[PDB]
Every structure is written in structure tokens, then in C-alpha cells.
Design a protein around this ligand. Structure first.
Ligand SMILES: Nc1ncnc2c1ncn2[C@@H]1O[C@H](COP(=O)(O)OP(=O)(O)OP(=O)(O)O)[C@@H](O)[C@H]1O
Ligand SMILES: Nc1ncnc2c1ncn2[C@@H]1O[C@H](COP(=O)(O)OP(=O)(O)O)[C@@H](O)[C@H]1O
Ligand SMILES: [Mg+2]
Ligand SMILES: [Mg+2]
Lengths: 466, 54, 479, 465, 128, 128
């Protein structure tokens, strides 16, 4: 049936229906507009009125304007025909290549997989990135999160991961841009056409793109992660297959939720966030998961408001992850890239029974020396190095080199560094740090360990200078 | 000879210690004032929410 | 006629509440009887909430409100060049009507993925520290950020003045139209600023949009969107424009005032949850267009003022997470005399090498690295020589106000330092060396500078020529 | 004729049957022994306005009659305000009877438009050596006066008044915003002793407007505007350069915060009003140079918690063109005025504005004092004869430089027993330049201490010993 | 059911931080006014009434018992925080874990100095 | 009454911290908008109108006086708290007392460095 608009404020529109009240989540179509304007039903207010969230701008809307119930949630193209294409929140092609001729559609709202559907398979996913592989390794089919404040390296890292892991993976990828830069979307698209992972001729494309960036109103930014996840869900289930899912940036989903909560009528919670922060997040995150039907390896970039990891948004996100990589501004300001905090990054598979006792012992040995060094710094900060014993002077020496050896040049960062990107095998990362811990390189300067790959490149860099 | 060297070196170490302390003080005072303002702001927004909800 | 007209119910609590206007659109411009304009923000069953673009105290209960039928828009076009306007695009310079033939919606969504292409043309500032270490490309957003009185506006103004050299010439791809948006500043300051631009002959290619300190908050809110729309006329018609938002800190506090009076729930520093989006939608509109959309670009230089160097604050981190880089200015570097007070460590261009002449990569492609390394550590081995290089290079990057340098003059100066010629010299003398050296290469070696410019590279014949210039110059002065 | 419908502290709601008063209009409550003015703040709907009371609301009754005056608060303006004290609503509070003025003026005037602005920066010569050389004042500018009590703050304000009228002829207005009553009385009498106010004739150089600490926030919030209004008559109608003192800006902001809370507005960061920057802006922007003349404003600034980033000083700082920093340490050294020569700043300290000669001397005097600071951190640790030959030369000159910064004031003649001096800018410059050049190394330091022009620095040495 | 039918049970609440958050959402959306940190006014009671149900029963009631190990997540080590302080004040003792200790190699990362348990029956063991 | 009739009175307010708390109770329960520390906006004005009534009258008005000694309790010595801030800004000076001085044997525990009388010398006999 058809409704009439009775109120408009930003993204939130009230609609009165004389007959047939549309269920919550149903997509409504506004009549009399140049491009499709969907309103998603959020609440039944009473008196045959629904409160809804707009998926595009609401300028030009008039009280009285007619609205049509589609009789279902927002539904999008899913299937192989999405690969190499770009879709917006509501599944429309935005790449000027015509219709997405899929044989199926799917609603963007779905029940999270049940407890019975869960898998417990733990298998290492080698990244070629020293800090990650060594201290907090990723798992195939696991949930990975990249935490960072403004401009610390989340996107550079996610793009390195796409470059390093997607090739080795033998299946399909989905990239969802949520509330990020439109030009990063343009860069990514054209780089994939150049490399061939997107093909504009054949059916050989291996990546599906879904975008709703920071130019978009909040309804779109809140829903678009669901659009991308729905595409990944099809590949996981209708194929039974291994999917990679990349999201930059999942924070923007929560932020967009707070902008509309403001107008939905809800009493605010801590720091002005929607009272439903943790449940909204859970309903979304629990679908981003491997099941018994197939595997999703997911990598999500996670913004940290004002560098505060205790902010409700990042704080609530940790519980959803199997591996976490935490980036630190302070570590970046030591010029260490990637700016991973070795004392704040964790993984479920960092277990001697899974990675081996050797990998494990070395990882813990590195963390122990970095923590011991951290403890000396309040004393050093004031009293300087001369108050330390000769054994503590060596812990400081070995720790500063270990800090620097965890740094690495990235293929994708050559535009900023002026250095060739490096990929380091796990066995070489293990051996490399194990030797520094043993004091096998106590004779080299610190700066020889900065921005190199395997350990043999430190020895070489040390001989470059006299 | 040793005592003259030791006293001069003590002077320098204490001079460096107090310069390092002053730098920390300056940085902590900035964090203090930021945090101070943010606690007033946070508290007040809570009371205003409590009042609006009635 | 209550379909096209309404009457004020209440006023003085921020937004005006208006009865009627049954046919009014959301975001439509409306007219009050006192001559003020407003924007229909809230469409409610029983009232229309109207944001007033002026002094709301001039409105009374019962006043007549009229529909315009148009979503908030502003005058746009080349008639605005050389003119000073307020946030609605009306003249405030005293020179009469603008004479515009076109208009654009202020809230128009930024171009999507497809209409764009990667930035590749230099946007030249003429400031050594920027063009070498933080190069801007046409269609980029680059934040200028620092405390009060650290030289933020000066970077912007020297950038505008620098374009005269291109705008007077032939090479049409190189022309750049400028828009200076002043938000929340004093009128005296804005007048001194248009004076300087007029003295430099920069006004003929510049539009000034001003919503000042005594202008109502909604005007300060609107100003950047209005300026941006004027920039977009160039962007979409195959031309290149540069926009300065001075500053977005002041825009955000006007929006916080509006949001608090509307009783939106405040978060950190009492800002509403949509402050990020306030700036993200604006800054997304600076873009480089692909050729199918005419090839134009709009470049943005937003300005943010930090408090006591706190770049981890809410509004600063929001904008950092929007723009394609930042130029960080620091008080400690400033009042020590290092001007522009660029912290070469923290300052990044998320585009980088992509939009820079080859000759600059050949020098700055090593200077950039030698300065974040230097910052960290602020007889000994290579650790100390990092400090010796870092001090010389820092002094080499100093530059007086209103002292534009062409890219070729810049590479020759950077060359002398980066190759290690001044390494034997004393840091104090670096400034004097640069001024005499530059004016000498300008006097007789126009052939060399010409060669580096046209070739866009330091060729082997240029490299060996310059090497002989610096060596013979270095020795031969009175000290 | 309206009728009171609600009273809650300093907030009064009033219903009008036909002639609804515009926002900012002054209303006069009928049947009260002293004048009670209500300023319209909002139109609530249903023919009702919300207003802010300019005095106490005790004894108000619902149904009590209220007259719309037809305009904002209007106050006496003109020469007859000089030597008088008025309150926010322009009544005399000095018990000297009516302020018999030929004109009145409304206190909510608009700031001058963009076309009315002077394109040029220009110097306001105070006659004070520290200020004029190192941190000069601009005509049409705002100056931040920093420092608490016992630092000669009242004597400096009075000297600025005295010197501005002495040299240029222009007048002063002093807005006491949220001051203690006892201190308003002290100032009034301190002004009578100095002669800036004269109760016997027409030679008073200042007009006073007082809005005391114990008045409602509505009154304390508008005091600055009342003073601005008095000032604006002199600038516009008499074509003058006027000086507006505001003591102090923090309390102006404080009262604005209280008014906003009374109106039930949601507070912003750190408790301040949402309109913090617009409140400030609508007031500060009336202090400018126009074609008829200029108003220059010296504003005492209190910094809560010593925190310069506190929203109140942070917002004010945006409007300031110079700072004058008064310090106890400088006073303890025996230097008056107690201006900190290194912490004071001025935006017009640019070669294009003050001249090449001014900038060089000032930057040269600034450097040698900075040298003297680093040289004194070696004497205390080590000793005087641990420094080189050129080191003692820079010390000797810098000691005479800080002594030639000190100055006897005309307004301080009644107490110390020494005659005060007004020094032109040209004599200040060439005097200080001669110390840096070394032309007075043969003279003792005490000759440079507490004198006017350099001609006194030469002559004082002859009198001594 | 075990406690009251002569048997012994151990219960782990993992974790009570997340239960308080859910309670806060529900209560706010019921339009019950937000208290400290937007939590309901009776968040203390939410936890105190639960944990008081762990008990040791006398023989006339069956001699059974229920032991509780609630779990609380702190933020950046802040035990002085609202919910953490509530539960500390309820429990008989607490096992404090710390990141510093964890990374130093102290695993389990128990802070022995701060960690407390109530005496112990004489019976923890005897050779222990 | 004493001030206006040519006499001299001294008044002690012990203490104004407790008076502001009571005023805050009334104001909040009247649902007046709350501010910093939940004190209403007119809490400054509460204390300013009270303390400005202490005055020294000239001979033409009888010569009398009222002197006020308000007492404020600080918490952990924080003079930047809302109510102590207000009162310090109103009065002509403060006598500041400290627990550290008290236990050191400085009794009365007056911190002379932090104490001031802005009237000062004018209120002393020549001998003193
Ligand atoms: N390269 C330079 N060399 C010398 N002086 C400079 C330079 N750049 C800026 N200045 C000076 O620094 C002062 C502050 O500059 P500017 O107004 O650009 O800073 P700002 O951060 O925008 O200040 P505001 O807080 O007033 O907006 C000006 O007086 C200017 O002349
Ligand atoms: N691995 C890296 N190597 C070198 N530079 C880096 C690296 N990661 C980040 N950066 C620097 O930081 C900037 C911001 O990184 P980005 O990932 O875009 O930040 P964000 O965390 O905001 O997404 C880059 O443009 C680059 O200058
Ligand atoms: Mg990013
Ligand atoms: Mg500026």
C-alpha cells in the first residue's frame, strides 16, 4: 500500500499509512523523485505512523508526498555477476556499466548464523608482515581488526594485506568502503583494473566492490556495511566457499548510528552514543563470520576517536575479533611503520600448541623485553641512562633494535617512503628476532634495523656506513 | 681529584634531571587541563540528560 | 494562503518556528518580512523549523514567511571574481550587484567514484617546505593545522598570490582561481587581507566569502558550503579552483551553537554526533574530475586551530581523517624563528610523490626522510651526523613571508643543502647563503633555471653545471 | 501594557494583548519604588515574551503591569557623562543628580559594516616606554591586560587615560563589569585624587559605567554594551579616538553564561553558553576604526585555573591585537610599570606598520634581555668571572635597558613624590637604540632608572655623587 | 537447584560488564531516566542481588553450596571505575590481572600483592 | 542593623559550602536548569549579594561597618572547584589553612604564601 510523509528532519522521515502498515525493516519508495529514494522502516510509533531512515538526501521532500511499500527489506544483486562491479547501499550500479544481471537477489538484513553453524578451525594465515606474523598472527576464516586514530596507517595496512594475502588466497574478495574517502575508492578501483584483479572484459574479476563513503548521509553510512556483508554471505553459502571480506571503516557504521539516534527519539548513553551501540554492533558483526558451510576471512579497519581506545565504539569492538592489530600514534612518531603496538596486539592462535613452541617462545621473549624496557622509561625519563647497570643497558639496547626490526617497508607505501616494499617469510621473522634476543647482533648500530626485510638486510645496511 | 670530578658530575646530573622533570611537568599540565575541562563537560552532559528524560 | 506562506509562532530559541508553509520543501530557502532569509530545516506535523541566515532578533511572532520554491542556493560564476560577498553571495564591498547568471545548491553531494581520476597536476604554493616535503596536487584536500598565530593564514595567502604567475601567462592548464572563505574572523582582519590581495594583484582571480564574528552562527555554518559551490562552478566547467576555509574550527563552534539550541545530544566537547559529517561532506567536494566530466579540479585548504598543540582533540582528528594530508605548524618552532613553523616530521601529503615535478623528487626524495629521523632525537657516531644534517636542512627550509619561489629556484636551493655543501658551513650562516646564492643564480644563471623548469628534471648537464656553481660560490665572501 | 504571567528568579514572562515588544526591547515594570527594566529575550508564542531582569525580582506579582518602552535600553550619551558613574540602564549612581544630556542612545547598536573598515594598521602612542617599543597598541585594537592585584594595574589604566587625553585629546570610558562594590568606590576616589575625574568642573577625562558583582547576570552582561554606547557617541558624533576599558572580560563571559542558563539553554564545553563566541563577537566587533574615528579597548583578562585553553580566555584571545603582561617579579625588582618585556606581545610589531627603525630596536632590545636571562643562569650556578669578555658587556647594557624601560607616572605623583613623564615614540626609539650602540657604557645604571627621555638619563648622572 | 538439593555448583558470569551495558540499553529505552554513566540508578542492586545468591547452606538445608566467579572488564586498568567498584565492594575477594604482568611473562597475570581471598576454612588443604 | 546605626559588627558564615548545597537541593527540585557540579547558574549571585552587604560606611552615613568571615571547605585542597572559585573571586582575600602545616606543628596552620589581605597595611596600627 501507499503512505504519506508527515515529518522530515535530516535522515529521519515519518510516514502515515491509512491501510497496511509496513513491517520494521521494509524498504519504502518515495514517489516523485529523480533518483530512487528508499526509506527503511525503523519504528512503529503508533497511530498508523512509522518512523524511517532515508538512504539518500531528503532535500526537496514535502509533507503529504506519497510513499510506496515494496513489501520487503532492501534487496540487492548477489552472485558472480557482482565481481568486478561497484554497487551502492541499495545495490544500484555506480560504475556506469549498466545492470548487474544476477540470477538472484538477497535482502541486506539477515539472521546471524546460529550457534550450531559455528566452526572451530584454527589455521595460521601468513601475512609477510613481521609484527603481525610474529606477535599476533591472523587466522584463515578468522575475524581481524585494525585499530588506529586519525592518520596512523589503517588503510595503508589494509591495502598491504589485500596485496599480500588476496593473491595467495584462491577465491573471491569483497571490499566495502564505509564512510571513508571517495578518492580512495577511485584509486582502489583503477589500481585493480590495472593489475587485472578486476577485468572489464571477461568474467575473471575476483573482487566485488560496495561503497558508501563520507559524502553520504547517515542512513547510507549505517546500512552499507550490511550491503557488502550480504554479498560476502552469498559467496560463503551458495558455493560453500572461502571469501575474503575487507571493510574500511567499520567505526563509521557506529558513528552513523549516533547521528540518527539523535533524531529517532532515544535517550543518549555515555559520550552521546546511541543506547543501542553494543546490540546494533552485535547484530551486524555476528553475520561477519565463518560457518560450517564456508569461510570468511574478514579484515576490518577500526577508527579510534581522539586516540582513546576506551571510547565506547572501539571498546565494544574488541570482543568481536579473533586477532587485533593496534596502531599507535606514539609508535608512528618514532617513524616506526607499520605503527603496530607490540604490547597491545593479540591473537587467539598465539598458542604453543598451534604456532609451535619456537614461534611462541620468541614472540613472548620479544614482548617481555619490550615491557621490561617500558618499565625502565620513567626512571630513564628523569635520571637518564647513567643510573642503569650494564645488564639493563643491554636490555635497552636489545629492545631498541627489536622495536626497529618490527618496522617494515610496504609495497603500497613506496609513494611515501622511497623504499622498496618487503615480504618476510614466517621462518625468517622467527629466526631473525630469535637471534637478536640471543645477542647475536649486539655489535650492530640501532639504525641498521630500521625499514628492512629479513635479518640479513640489517647486517648489509650496517656495512653501508662506517 | 675524584671529589672535584664527582661534584661537578653531580651538578650536571641534577641539572639534567630537573630539566627533564620540567619538560614532563609542562606536558602533564597540558593533559591535566584538557582532562579537567573534559570532566566538567562530561558530568554536565549527564545531568542534562537526566533532566531531559524526566 | 497557508500553502505558500506561514506565520511565525515563536523566535529566540535558535530555530524559528513557523505555522503554515504546507507546501514547503525540506531545505528550501524561505523569506521573512524583515528581509532576512532562512532555511526550512524541520518539517513537523504542526510547524516548520526555520534556520535564520541573519539576526533572528529582527523576527517577531506573527511575521509573514514566504516560500521561494528553491532549495538553498547561491550565485555562482566568473562575475564573483574580484568581489567580496557574505555567506548568501550578496556583495559587501560596496561595488553594487554581482551580476551572476547561474546558481548552485549549497548542499549538493560530492562527485562519486566514477567521475573522478587520480590527482596528477601540481598545485604550487611557492613555499619551499610545502612544495618539496608536502606537495599538493590539484583536487587534493590538505589541512593547515596549528595553534593561534603560528602562520596558518600566511601559507594560504602566499599560495593565492603565487598563482598570479600562472594566471598572467598562456599555459591554461596551469591557471588557478582562488576562493578565500573567512569564517568567524574580525571584519578589520578580512579588510586588511583583501587589501594585501589587491596590492599583490591577486583579487582579480579571487572570490572572498565572509561570515565574520558578529554574523549569526547559521551564516558561519553556511559560508564554507557557499564558497565551495562557487569553486564547483570552476571544477565542473573544465577549470581549476583553490578554496581556503579559514577556519573550520570556527565553523564547527557555530554549528555546535545551533545544535545545542536545537537540544541535540552533545558528545565530546559538547559537539553533536554529526560534526564529522559537517566537514566530511564539505571536503569530499574538492575533487579532480576525469576528462568525461571536463578535467577540472577543486583543491581545498581547510584551516584548523589547535589548543596548546593538541592534535588529538575531536575536531582536529575528524579533519585529519578527512583530508589527504596535513601541514602541522608548531608554536615552539615558530617563536624560535623557524618560519614557516612546519613540523617536517608530522606533516604528510597522503598523495605524496604522485603530483610533483621530477626535479623535486630528485632532491626532496631524501630530504623528507632525513627530517622525521632528525625530529626523534630532539663524540658520537652516525646518530650525531643525523643531527648535523637535520639542522642545516631545517634552516634551508626557512622562508620569509610573501617571498614566492618558482619550482626551479626551489630545487637549486634544496640541491645545495641535500648534496652536503652546507655541511661544512655553520647553521647561523645558512640563511645568508640562501639569499645571496638565490639572487646570484637568478642574475646570470637563468639558463640553468630555464633548463630545469622546461625539462621538469635535473639533467646530467644541469647537474654538473649546478655542482660548479655551488662549489665556486661557497668560497668567496666577507666574514 | 503587558502583564506579568511568570516569575522565576531573574526570568520574567509577560503577556501583551496587542503590541508585542521585539526582542531586545526594554520593558518598565509598573508600581515599583526604583526602576526595574526587563529586556526581551524570546517570543514564546501565544502573545507571551520571556525577558531578563536588570534588577531584583522580589515583590513581583502575576498580573502586575508592564510597559513596553518601544526600544532597547537607551542611555545618556555626550560630554556630560564624563566624571559621572552610571549603571547598565544609564541612571546616575553617584548621588550627584541627573546626567543632563542632550542625546540618548540605544545599547544594542550593530558593529560597523565591512565597507566602513580601515584597510590600514595604525599605532596608538601611549607615552609609556615598555608598551610603545615592545608591544605597541593599535588604534581600533583590543589589548589584553594580564595580571592580578598589587602590580600597578589601576595606576596603569589611569596613566593610559591621562596620557591619551594629554597627548591626543580623546576621552575614556571605563566599564566595570562584575566588580566588587568596594573596588568601584576605591577606583572612583583614586580617579578623583589623580585628576582624571574632577567633581568641580568639566575637565573629567573618563565616564564610568558600573555593573556590580551583586547585580543580576542580565545587568552584568550588558554593562560592556552600555560603555560601548557611551564610547560610540565620542567616536561618531565628535569624530574622536576613544579608549574603552573593560574590567573585566571574564565576568562579561560569566554573566553571559548565567543568562544562557537562566533561559534553560543546554550548556556547552566546560559549562559555558552555546553562544559563547557570538556573544563575544557581537560586542568586540563594535570596537573598530571607522572613518569618523576609532575606539581602542584595554581589557583586563582573568584566566581560570591558569588555563589559557579554557573556552573563556581562548575565545577572547581571538579578538586581541596585543597583550600587556603585568608581573610581580618585575615589580619585586623595583621596575614600574611592572610590564614583562618578554611576555608582552603585539600583532602590529611588523616593519611595514611601525617602521623599520622601530622593529629593529625593539627586536634588538628583546634579544639582549633574552641574552641576559641565559647569562644569569651561569652566574648563579658558577660565577660572574666564568663568562667571557663580550658577555659582561651585554649584561651591563641589558641592566640599563630594563632600567630605561621603567618610567615615573603622572598619576603616581601624589604618593612617591617624584614627577611623572610622558615620552614620545621617537624619543623612546632613539633612546633605546643608543644603549644597544654602546654610547652610554661610561654611565652608571642608576641614571637610567625611573626617568623620561634619554636627556634625563644624561643629566641625572651629573646630579648624582 | 544444586545448592538447595545437597550438591555443590560453581558459576562463572563472563562477564558482568556486558550485562550492565544490556541493562542500561533496556532501561533507557523503557524511558527510565539515565543515572551515573547513563546506567540505571540501581546498577549496584543488579549485581548485589545476583552475587548474594552464591551461598554455603547449613545441614538442615542440605549442606549444599554455590560459588560464584564473576568477571569484570576494566578499561586501561581503571578499577576505580563505577561498575568495577560496585562489584569489588560486593565480592568476598578478587583476583586482579594486569597487562604489564602478562607481557613481562607473569602468566597467569595475577597481582599477588593486590589479590585477596577471604581467610579459608582452615581447609584449603594442610600440606598446602 | 549595627552597620546602619553607627556600630560595628563581625559576621562568620560557617560555612558557605553547606549553604550552596542546600540551595542546589531547592533549585534542582524546583527543576531549575542545573549547571556545573549540578549547582544552578545563580549560585554565584547567591554568594555575591550576601558578601557585598559587608561594607565600611563613611561618616555621612553613620560610620558603622559590617565585616564578614565566610568559611569555605575545600576537597583535597582544590580551590578551582565551583563554589570555592566563586567565593575567592568575591572576597577581599583569604586565610588558607593546611593539614600538612598543622601536623608539622604550624598551628594555627596558616599557609602565609597562599594567604592574602587585599586591604593589607590600611587595616593595621602603626605599631604593627
Ligand atoms: N614565513 C614567515 N616569515 C616571517 N613571519 C611570518 C611568516 N609567516 C607568518 N608570519 C607572521 O606570523 C604572524 C601570524 O601569522 P598568521 O596570521 O598567518 O598566523 P595564524 O595562525 O593564521 O594566526 P591567527 O590565530 O591570528 O589566525 C603574522 O604576524 C605573520 O606576519
Ligand atoms: N606502512 C606505512 N609506511 C609508511 N608510511 C605510512 C604507513 N602507514 C601509514 N603511513 C603514513 O601515514 C599516512 C596515513 O595512513 P592511512 O593508512 O591513510 O591513515 P588512516 O589510519 O587514517 O587510514 C600515510 O599517507 C603515510 O604517510
Ligand atoms: Mg584510512
Ligand atoms: Mg589566521
Amino acid at each position: 500500500t501507499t503512505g504519506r510523509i508527515v515529518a522530515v528532519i535530516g535522515a529521519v522521515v515519518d510516514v502515515q499509512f491509512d491501510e497496511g502498515l509496513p513491517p520494521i525493516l521494509n524498504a519504502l519508495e518515495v514517489q516523485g523523485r529523480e533518483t530512487r529514494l528508499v526509506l527503511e522502516v525503523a519504528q512503529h510509533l503508533g497511530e498508523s505512523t512509522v518512523r524511517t531512515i532515508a538512504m539518500d538526501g531528503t532535500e526537496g521532500l514535502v509533507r503529504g508526498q506519497k510513499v510506496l511499500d515494496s513489501g520487503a527489506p532492501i534487496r540487492i544483486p548477489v552472485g558472480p555477476e557482482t565481481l568486478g562491479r561497484i554497487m551502492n547501499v541499495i545495490g544500484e550500479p555506480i560504475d556506469e556499466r549498466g545492470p548487474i544481471k544476477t540470477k538472484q537477489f538477497a535482502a541486506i538484513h539477515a539472521e546471524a548464523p546460529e550457534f550450531v553453524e559455528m566452526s572451530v578451525e584454527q589455521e595460521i594465515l601468513v601475512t609477510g608482515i613481521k609484527v603481525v606474523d610474529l606477535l599476533a598472527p591472523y587466522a584463515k576464516g578468522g575475524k581481524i581488526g585494525l585499530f588506529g586514530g586519525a592518520g596512523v596507517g589503517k588503510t595503508v595496512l589494509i591495502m598491504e594485506l589485500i596485496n599480500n594475502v588476496a593473491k595467495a588466497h584462491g577465491g573471491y574478495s569483497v571490499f566495502a568502503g564505509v564512510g571513508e574517502r571517495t578518492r580512495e575508492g577511485n584509486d582502489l578501483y583503477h589500481e585493480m583494473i590495472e593489475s587485472g584483479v578486476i577485468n572489464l572484459k571477461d568474467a575473471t574479476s575476483k573482487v566485488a566492490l560496495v561503497y558508501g563513503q563520507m559524502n553520504e548521509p547517515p542512513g547510507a553510512r549505517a546500512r552499507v556495511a550490511l550491503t557488502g556483508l550480504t554479498v560476502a554471505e552469498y559467496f560463503r553459502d551458495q558455493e560453500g566457499q572461502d571469501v575474503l571480506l575487507f571493510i574500511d571503516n567499520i567505526f563509521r557504521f557506529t558513528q552513523a548510528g549516533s547521528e540518527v539516534s539523535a533524531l529517532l527519539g532515544r535517550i543518549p548513553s555515555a559520550v552521546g552514543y546511541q543506547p543501542t551501540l553494543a546490540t546494533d554492533m552485535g547484530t551486524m558483526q555476528e553475520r561477519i563470520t565463518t560457518t560450517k558451510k564456508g569461510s570468511i576471512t574478514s579484515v576490518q579497519a577500526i577508527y579510534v576517536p581522539a586516540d582513546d581506545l576506551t571510547d565506547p565504539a572501539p571498546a565494544t569492538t574488541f570482543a568481536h575479533l579473533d586477532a587485533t592489530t593496534v596502531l599507535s600514534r606514539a609508535i608512528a612518531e618514532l617513524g616506526i611503520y607499520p605503527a603496530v603496538d607490540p604490547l597491545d596486539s593479540t591473537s587467539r592462535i598465539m598458542d604453543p600448541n598451534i604456532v609451535g613452541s619456537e614461534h611462541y617462545d620468541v614472540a613472548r621473549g620479544v614482548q617481555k623485553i619490550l615491557q621490561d624496557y617500558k618499565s625502565l622509561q620513567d626512571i630513564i625519563a628523569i635520571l637518564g641512562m647513567d643510573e642503569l647497570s650494564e645488564e639493563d643497558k643491554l636490555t635497552v639496547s636489545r629492545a631498541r633494535k627489536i622495536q626497529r626490526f618490527l618496522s617494515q617497508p610496504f609495497q603500497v607505501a613506496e609513494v611515501f617512503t622511497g623504499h622498496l616494499g618487503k615480504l618476510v617469510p614466517l621462518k625468517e621473522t622467527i629466526k631473525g628476532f630469535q637471534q637478536i634476543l640471543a645477542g647475536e647482533y649486539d655489535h650492530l648500530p640501532e639504525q641498521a634495523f630500521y625499514m628492512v626485510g629479513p635479518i640479513e638486510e640489517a647486517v648489509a645496511k650496517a656495512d653501508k656506513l662506517a | 681529584e675524584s671529589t672535584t670530578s664527582e661534584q661537578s658530575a653531580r651538578m650536571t646530573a641534577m641539572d639534567n634531571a630537573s630539566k627533564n622533570a620540567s619538560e614532563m611537568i609542562d606536558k602533564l599540565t597540558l593533559t591535566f587541563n584538557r582532562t579537567r575541562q573534559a570532566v566538567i563537560t562530561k558530568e554536565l552532559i549527564e545531568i542534562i540528560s537526566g533532566a531531559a528524560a524526566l | 494562503d497557508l500553502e505558500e506562506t506561514g506565520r511565525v509562532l515563536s523566535i529566540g530559541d535558535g530555530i524559528a518556528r513557523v505555522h503554515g508553509l504546507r507546501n514547503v520543501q525540506a531545505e528550501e530557502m524561505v523569506e521573512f518580512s524583515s528581509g532576512l532569509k532562512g532555511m526550512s530545516l524541520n518539517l513537523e506535523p504542526d510547524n516548520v523549523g526555520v534556520v535564520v541566515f541573519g539576526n533572528d532578533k529582527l523576527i517577531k511572532e506573527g511575521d509573514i514567511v514566504k516560500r521561494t520554491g528553491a532549495i538553498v542556493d547561491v550565485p555562482v560564476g566568473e562575475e564573483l571574481l574580484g568581489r567580496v560577498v557574505d555567506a548568501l553571495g550578496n556583495a559587501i564591498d560596496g561595488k553594487g550587484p554581482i551580476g551572476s547568471k547561474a546558481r548552485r545548491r549549497v548542499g549538493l553531494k560530492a562527485p562519486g567514484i566514477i567521475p573522478r581520476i587520480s590527482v596528477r597536476e601540481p598545485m604550487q604554493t611557492g613555499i619551499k617546505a610545502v612544495d618539496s616535503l608536502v606537495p599538493i596536487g590539484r583536487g587534493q584536500r590538505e589541512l593547515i593545522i596549528g595553534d593561534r598565530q603560528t602562520g596558518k593564514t600566511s601559507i594560504a595567502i602566499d599560495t593565492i598570490i603565487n598563482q598570479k604567475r600562472f594566471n598572467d601567462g598562456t599555459d591554461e592548464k596551469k591557471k588557478l582561481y582562488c576562493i578565500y572563505v573567512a569564517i568567524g574572523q574580525k571584519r578589520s582582519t578580512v579588510a586588511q587581507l583583501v587589501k594585501r590581495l589587491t596590492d599583490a594583484d591577486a583579487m582579480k582571480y579571487t572570490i572572498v566569502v565572509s561570515a565574520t564574528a558578529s554574523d549569526a552562527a547559521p551564516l558561519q555554518y553556511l559560508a564554507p558550503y557557499s564558497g565551495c559551490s562557487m569553486g564547483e562552478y570552476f571544477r565542473d566547467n573544465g577549470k581549476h579552483a583553490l578554496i581556503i576555509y579559514d577556519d573550520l574550527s570556527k565553523q564547527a563552534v557555530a554549528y555546535r551553537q545551533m545544535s545545542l539550541l536545537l537540544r541535540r545530544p552533545p558528545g565530546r566537547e559538547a559537539y553533536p554526533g554529526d560534526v564529522f559529517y559537517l566537514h566530511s561532506r564539505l571536503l569530499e567536494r574538492a575533487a579532480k574530475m576525469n576528462d568525461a566530466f571536463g578535467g577540472g579540479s577543486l583543491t581545498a585548504l581547510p584551516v584548523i586551530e589547535t589548543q596548546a598543540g593538541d592534535v588529538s582533540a575531536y575536531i582536529p582528528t575528524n579533519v585529519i581523517s578527512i583530508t589527504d594530508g596535513q601541514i602541522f605548524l608548531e608554536t615552539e618552532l615558530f617563536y624560535k624563528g623557524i618560519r614557516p613553523a612546519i613540523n617536517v616530521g608530522l606533516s604528510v601529503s597522503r598523495v605524496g610523490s604522485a603530483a610533483q615535478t621530477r626535479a623535486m623528487k630528485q632532491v626532496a626524495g631524501t630530504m623528507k626522510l632525513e627530517l622525521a629521523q632528525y625530529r626523534e632525537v630532539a663524540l658520537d657516531a652516525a646518530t650525531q651526523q643525523l643531527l648535523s644534517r637535520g639542522v642545516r636542512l631545517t634552516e634551508l627550509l626557512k622562508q620569509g613571508q610573501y617571498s614566492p619561489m618558482a619550482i626551479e629556484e626551489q630545487v637549486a636551493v634544496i640541491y645545495a643543502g641535500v648534496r652536503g655543501y652546507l655541511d661544512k658551513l655553520e647553521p647561523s650562516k645558512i640563511t645568508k647563503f640562501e639569499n645571496a646564492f638565490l639572487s646570484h643564480v637568478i642574475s646570470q644563471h637563468q639558463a640553468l633555471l630555464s633548463k630545469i623548469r622546461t625539462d621538469g628534471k635535473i639533467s646530467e648537464e644541469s647537474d654538473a653545471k649546478l655542482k660548479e656553481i655551488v662549489t665556486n660560490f661557497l668560497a668567496g665572501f666577507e666574514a
